[PDB]
């Protein structure tokens, strides 16, 4: 039942997520780089 569309939206979400994942993790480790930086 739509397995094309299915299919599409099963994958294009997955990559997704390593894409916001990557964002995500920098926004930890950006923060401490950032203030331990300065000094």
Same mark, same amino acid.
């Given at each position: 039942?739509?397995? *094309?569309?299915?299919?599409?939206?099963?994958?294009? *979400? *997955?990559? #997704?997520?390593?894409?916001?994942?990557? #964002? #995500? #993790?920098?926004?930890?480790?950006?923060?401490?780089?950032?203030?331990?930086?300065?000094?």
């Amino acid at each position: 039942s739509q397995a *094309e569309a299915t299919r599409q939206a099963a994958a294009q *979400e *997955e990559r #997704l997520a390593d894409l916001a994942s990557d #964002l #995500l #993790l920098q926004y930890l480790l950006q923060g401490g780089a950032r203030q331990r930086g300065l000094g």
